[PDB]
Amino acid sequence: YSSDLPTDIPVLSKRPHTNLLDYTFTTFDKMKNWARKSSFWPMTFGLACCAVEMMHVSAPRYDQDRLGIIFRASPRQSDIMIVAGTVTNKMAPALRQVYDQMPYPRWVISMGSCANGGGYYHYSYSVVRGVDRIVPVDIYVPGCPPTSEALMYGVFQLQKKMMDGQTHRMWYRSY
Amino acid sequence: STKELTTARIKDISKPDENNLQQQAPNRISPWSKSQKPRAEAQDNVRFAVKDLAKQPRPYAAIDLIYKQPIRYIEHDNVAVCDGNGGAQGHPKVYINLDQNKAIPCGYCGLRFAQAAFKEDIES
Amino acid sequence: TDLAKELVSGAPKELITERVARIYQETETWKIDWDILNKGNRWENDLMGYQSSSDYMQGTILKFDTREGAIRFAKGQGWDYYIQEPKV
Amino acid sequence: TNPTAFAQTTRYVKDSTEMRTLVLNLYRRYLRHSRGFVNNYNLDIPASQVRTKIRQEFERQRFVKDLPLKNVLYMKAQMEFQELVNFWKQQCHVMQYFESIKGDSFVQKFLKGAQ
Amino acid sequence: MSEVEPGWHYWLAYGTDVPPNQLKPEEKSVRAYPVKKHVPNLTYTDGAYVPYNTARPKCATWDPKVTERP
Amino acid sequence: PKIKKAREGVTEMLLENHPLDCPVCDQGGECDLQEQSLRYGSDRGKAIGPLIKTSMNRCIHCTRCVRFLNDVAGNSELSANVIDLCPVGALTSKPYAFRARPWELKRTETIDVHDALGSNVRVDTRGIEVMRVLPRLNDEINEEWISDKTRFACDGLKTQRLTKPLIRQGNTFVDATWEEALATIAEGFQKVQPKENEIKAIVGSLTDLESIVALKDLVNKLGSENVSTDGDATTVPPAHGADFRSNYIFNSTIDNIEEADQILLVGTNPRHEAAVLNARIRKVWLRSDLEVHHVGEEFDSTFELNHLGSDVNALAKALTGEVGKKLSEASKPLIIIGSGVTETQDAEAVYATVAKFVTSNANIVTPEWNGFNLLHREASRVGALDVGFTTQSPEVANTKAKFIYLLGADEIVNKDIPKDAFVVYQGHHGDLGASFADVILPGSAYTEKTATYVNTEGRVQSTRAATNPPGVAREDWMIIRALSEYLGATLPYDNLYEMRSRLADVAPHLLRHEVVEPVSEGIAKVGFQSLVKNPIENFYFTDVISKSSPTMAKCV
Numbered sequence A: 001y002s003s004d005l006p007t008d009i010p011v012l013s014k015r016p017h018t019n020l021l022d023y024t025f026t027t028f029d030k031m032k033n034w035a036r037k038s039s040f041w042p043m044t045f046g047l048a049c050c051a052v053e054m055m056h057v058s059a060p061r062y063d064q065d066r067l068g069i070i071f072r073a074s075p076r077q078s079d080i081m082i083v084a085g086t087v088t089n090k091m092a093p094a095l096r097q098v099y100d101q102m103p104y105p106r107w108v109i110s111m112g113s114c115a116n117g118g119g120y121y122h123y124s125y126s127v128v129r130g131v132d133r134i135v136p137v138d139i140y141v142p143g144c145p146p147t148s149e150a151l152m153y154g155v156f157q158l159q160k161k162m163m164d165g166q167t168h169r170m171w172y173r174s175y
Numbered sequence B: 001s002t003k004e005l006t007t008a009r010i011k012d013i014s015k016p017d018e019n020n021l022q023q024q025a026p027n028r029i030s031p032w033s034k035s036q037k038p039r040a041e042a043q044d045n046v047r048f049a050v051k052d053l054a055k056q057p058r059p060y061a062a063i064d065l066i067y068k069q070p071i072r073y074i075e076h077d078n079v080a081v082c083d084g085n086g087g088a089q090g091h092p093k094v095y096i097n098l099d100q101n102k103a104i105p106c107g108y109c110g111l112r113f114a115q116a117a118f119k120e121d122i123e124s
Numbered sequence C: 001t002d003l004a005k006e007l008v009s010g011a012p013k014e015l016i017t018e019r020v021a022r023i024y025q026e027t028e029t030w031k032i033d034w035d036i037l038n039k040g041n042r043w044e045n046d047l048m049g050y051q052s053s054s055d056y057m058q059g060t061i062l063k064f065d066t067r068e069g070a071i072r073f074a075k076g077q078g079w080d081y082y083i084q085e086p087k088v
Numbered sequence D: 001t002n003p004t005a006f007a008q009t010t011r012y013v014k015d016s017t018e019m020r021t022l023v024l025n026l027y028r029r030y031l032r033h034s035r036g037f038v039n040n041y042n043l044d045i046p047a048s049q050v051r052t053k054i055r056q057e058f059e060r061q062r063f064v065k066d067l068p069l070k071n072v073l074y075m076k077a078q079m080e081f082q083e084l085v086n087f088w089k090q091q092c093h094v095m096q097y098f099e100s101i102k103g104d105s106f107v108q109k110f111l112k113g114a115q
Numbered sequence E: 001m002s003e004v005e006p007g008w009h010y011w012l013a014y015g016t017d018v019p020p021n022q023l024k025p026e027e028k029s030v031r032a033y034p035v036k037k038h039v040p041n042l043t044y045t046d047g048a049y050v051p052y053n054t055a056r057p058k059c060a061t062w063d064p065k066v067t068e069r070p
Numbered sequence F: 001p002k003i004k005k006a007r008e009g010v011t012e013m014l015l016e017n018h019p020l021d022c023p024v025c026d027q028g029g030e031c032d033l034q035e036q037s038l039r040y041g042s043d044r045g046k047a048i049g050p051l052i053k054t055s056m057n058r059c060i061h062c063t064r065c066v067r068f069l070n071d072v073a074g075n076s077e078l079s080a081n082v083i084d085l086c087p088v089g090a091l092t093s094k095p096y097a098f099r100a101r102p103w104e105l106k107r108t109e110t111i112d113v114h115d116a117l118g119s120n121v122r123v124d125t126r127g128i129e130v131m132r133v134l135p136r137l138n139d140e141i142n143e144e145w146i147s148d149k150t151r152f153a154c155d156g157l158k159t160q161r162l163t164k165p166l167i168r169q170g171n172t173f174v175d176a177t178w179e180e181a182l183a184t185i186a187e188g189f190q191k192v193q194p195k196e197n198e199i200k201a202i203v204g205s206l207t208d209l210e211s212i213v214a215l216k217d218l219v220n221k222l223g224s225e226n227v228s229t230d231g232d233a234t235t236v237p238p239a240h241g242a243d244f245r246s247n248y249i250f251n252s253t254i255d256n257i258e259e260a261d262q263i264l265l266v267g268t269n270p271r272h273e274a275a276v277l278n279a280r281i282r283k284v285w286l287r288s289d290l291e292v293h294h295v296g297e298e299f300d301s302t303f304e305l306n307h308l309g310s311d312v313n314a315l316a317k318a319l320t321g322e323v324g325k326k327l328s329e330a331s332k333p334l335i336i337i338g339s340g341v342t343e344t345q346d347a348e349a350v351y352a353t354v355a356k357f358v359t360s361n362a363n364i365v366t367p368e369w370n371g372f373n374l375l376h377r378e379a380s381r382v383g384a385l386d387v388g389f390t391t392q393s394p395e396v397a398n399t400k401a402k403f404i405y406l407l408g409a410d411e412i413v414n415k416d417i418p419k420d421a422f423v424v425y426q427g428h429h430g431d432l433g434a435s436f437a438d439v440i441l442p443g444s445a446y447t448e449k450t451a452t453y454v455n456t457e458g459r460v461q462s463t464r465a466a467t468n469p470p471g472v473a474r475e476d477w478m479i480i481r482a483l484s485e486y487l488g489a490t491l492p493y494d495n496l497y498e499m500r501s502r503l504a505d506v507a508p509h510l511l512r513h514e515v516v517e518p519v520s521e522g523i524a525k526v527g528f529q530s531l532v533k534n535p536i537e538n539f540y541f542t543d544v545i546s547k548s549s550p551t552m553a554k555c556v
């Protein structure tokens, strides 16, 4: 057959808009990502001492609600899952069931040392050494516990990633 | 040049460059420890394929910022006192006997000392 | 001594058979530890040089009081063992 | 306080014969719930398979001799019954319970690393 | 937030009444190495920090050498 | 009470001019100044060598760095023992300096293999690296002393190591798997088709006894008898012969030296042949009426001798004159034959001359004493002799063997290795013996294996494993059984216990750990009836580990 693939055509995250369609599907991506950037509804998965900080963000001093963050208990209504606190072995199968029920798109934030890599209880017979063995993670917040601002900083960095989503342009250019 | 980058040396025969990303440090090419893994070898790994080498942490080598510092001198005494040269936020106080005729570094700071008479002999 | 207590301790099958425990004396009391594995006791992690290990008994040491007390324990659990007599 | 479903008092049985009859009823209790274990945990193996594995479990350790260690083995097996019948173990643990499992010559072990 | 220079970053946190541009020289930091422009946190970009082991392998293999029969 | 002030007084005095070097002290975590200025004290208030990092700034004095030197050791082969004696970090080891902390190191109790004493030592490791070796007390053998060779050859195991199988393709070894290496030997084995005497096996100084026994079974099933160590014994069968134990063992053992009167040095340099025992003689030589006569090549010693000359004919007039008269007079006389005798041309003359003096008197051999002993220098010779791993025919030693399988053997320059022969070397270093090889099989360092060794006094001492072998190396004997399947000579031994099970058939003493089976007075005299230049060039180049040790490069 006849085939000729160029070589200097760049990757999607580096490819500039060229024609008018590349501006149309960038509008749809920004408009759609802006909706998810603002309506950032995590799930109250507080497990351990890290959960106290996740409450203090909702406290009047920081007021997560001002940024459009409204915790939703049910996984179906929550598009984020802030895994805060130690993930014991007795919990890990249950955590996977809660994660798999989140409709796409879905993000996971690992807050604190226990959720990241084991933390204090890394050498425990009944502690998962890092929740990344169970669910994919998009951002890691370091601390013990991370300060209420550190979680907000971790939220902001993930927001900056969501605003970089290019799904509807990917169909036009990478698919 | 694939020879000094993977060998430990007291100094460097060539003049180092700040903009060479294969050196161990911006201010030194060859590593300053026999067991220290050369930076050129480490960056030849799977995880440096798309990661930019420019932004990686390249702090200036310690073994140079000391040797730029001129040697301190002591006049009419053979005991050198050094306690960090910063007050009470330094290293524990140590006394340095100056009987030997060369530059004897401090225990922690690496500062070198001398005497009044041997000032001309040690500088040779 | 005659009791097959290994069915109640919950230990894995490998402790009964494939592991050897040394009863030594470091100066008034005796200790028990397991001899190292043939391979996989310590391999250098290729990421950060961490001392990885698959042996789960490397960090375990039991402080006893008397020799016969230690031997009683080893027979009770069904553990293979040998005794190192200290030099006088 | 009200004890949960399928509970028994922890008693130090001082008879050889009574323990024999307690076990025999227990083995039937597992077989009676063979259909349930398939439907409760959604196991991929049919009802006859579970009974086959349960039999392989009960046949395995029938030759124990110590009565003080008979009660301990009967006590913990009761807990395994109570945990399973009350639907307490997660689905994954039961699936992996039945999914567990000939050696090789010295040359084969020498080359790769043995143990 | 990481764009905030560390000197000022302590002032914005209400830990000091003296702004970093009003320090007396007896208190500042004097370094023997250049202090280039501030660099923020570099996650989600190819400039992200990569850990590596700074120590050579503890065992050194043998160099092949042959001398023939006399 | 009032007494406690004495502790609070001496503690205060010592910590007066002491440096505040505890973080930077080489042995800051175990000095007996801190641990004794805490329990008993209050709370408030030049260089000598490339081996000892001297800092008298940290001394508390007591001259223990001085008292020991003029007592035990007396350019000193034992000056490194000063490091372990000074409590404070005044004199710390240089090679180990600034590398580890005592609270992190893992300790194992094992034995030296450099010489034939097999002294008990304690090894302090860190993961997969041995940091330092220290002596562990044993009054029977060493009692707190180890020569500078043993404790400063540790880093020899961190370089030159054979970690992979190697295959020769031209004149340079290449990295090849175990599957091909165990086949390239068998492939080329039948290319040349060696005959009964065309197969040769040479065992090195550091080769353990499990490999020594297990190699014979592989050799025997292929029909060969050209097996011996890498010595230079002119007499093809050993002059003492492997027939009887007393022929080659220290029947007195080490704990029967301090109660001797007359000692004979049969061509030996005990300072350079056994440093631990050399000071033992010096310690006795100070207070006792000890008389030692020198018969052999001239040398320099910590102590004077009743020196005679340099030739064998000097000993001819010894056992019959006043030199041997005091031997008759001695209630516990001592005769010592070094490892340098069998190498000499007149080795056969040595045993007949002396044993005629041991079959003559009766006070030499009592129900409690044996006046004749051997002093070998390798850790594999005695193991070879107690298992009969030696040839018994000059004709077999003359064969131009087509297949020489080296097992730890290095000193084979005087060994006629045919150029066309198939040479396979199994070991744990790249040295003289490695160049001759064709297919190299990596072995194991003595600390990395559970190897049963036999010292020059007949004591059976094993080792406890410290670290895994480097790279993909295996145990020493495990290769032979692995090599057995590739030649049709499979051995029935499948685990390390079975290798010791085979040792049961060899002898009963091999399975007695730390237990010495002697030769009975009613039989050792029958073994006596069978009988009727210093061997070492460089002190720091004796074994494989010393030659490859970067530290010993500072000892030259």
Ligand SMILES: CCCCCCCCCCCC(=O)OC[C@H](COP(=O)(O)OCC[N+](C)(C)C)OC(=O)CCCCCCCCCCC
Residues within 6 Å of the ligand: A030, A031, A034, A163, A164
């Ligand atoms: C009818 C359907 C319902 C209503 C639709 C509107 C919903 C809200 C839309 C959110 C938009 C959004 O998020 O735009 C804001 C984001 C945030 O910037 P950033 O993501 O960091 O990239 C921007 C920086 N760059 C490109 C260099 C990386 O982009 C923009 O600055 C887009 C550019 C500004 C557009 C202004 C001109 C168009 C005006 C159109 C209105 C008359």
Ligand code: SF4
Residues within 6 Å of the ligand: A048, A049, A050, A051, A084, A085, A086, A111, A112, A113, A114, A115, A119, A120, A143, A144, A145, A146
């Ligand atoms: S990381 Fe620290 S604060 Fe968070 S759950 Fe673990 S122990 Fe608690």
Ligand code: SF4
Residues within 6 Å of the ligand: F018, F019, F020, F021, F022, F023, F025, F027, F028, F029, F031, F032, F033, F034, F058, F088, F089, F090
């Ligand atoms: S010898 Fe002991 S007390 Fe003295 S400086 Fe060293 S660690 Fe400190």
Ligand code: SF4
Residues within 6 Å of the ligand: F056, F059, F060, F061, F062, F063, F064, F065, F066, F085, F086, F087, F088, F090, F091
């Ligand atoms: S042995 Fe140590 S404490 Fe004693 S005098 Fe010598 S340096 Fe001082």
Ligand SMILES: [K+]
Residues within 6 Å of the ligand: F027, F083, F084, F085, F086, F087, F088, F089, F090, F091, F092
């Ligand atoms: K010391």
Ligand SMILES: [Zn+2]
Residues within 6 Å of the ligand: B082, B083, B084, B085, B091, B106, B107, B108, B109, B110, B111
């Ligand atoms: Zn200083």
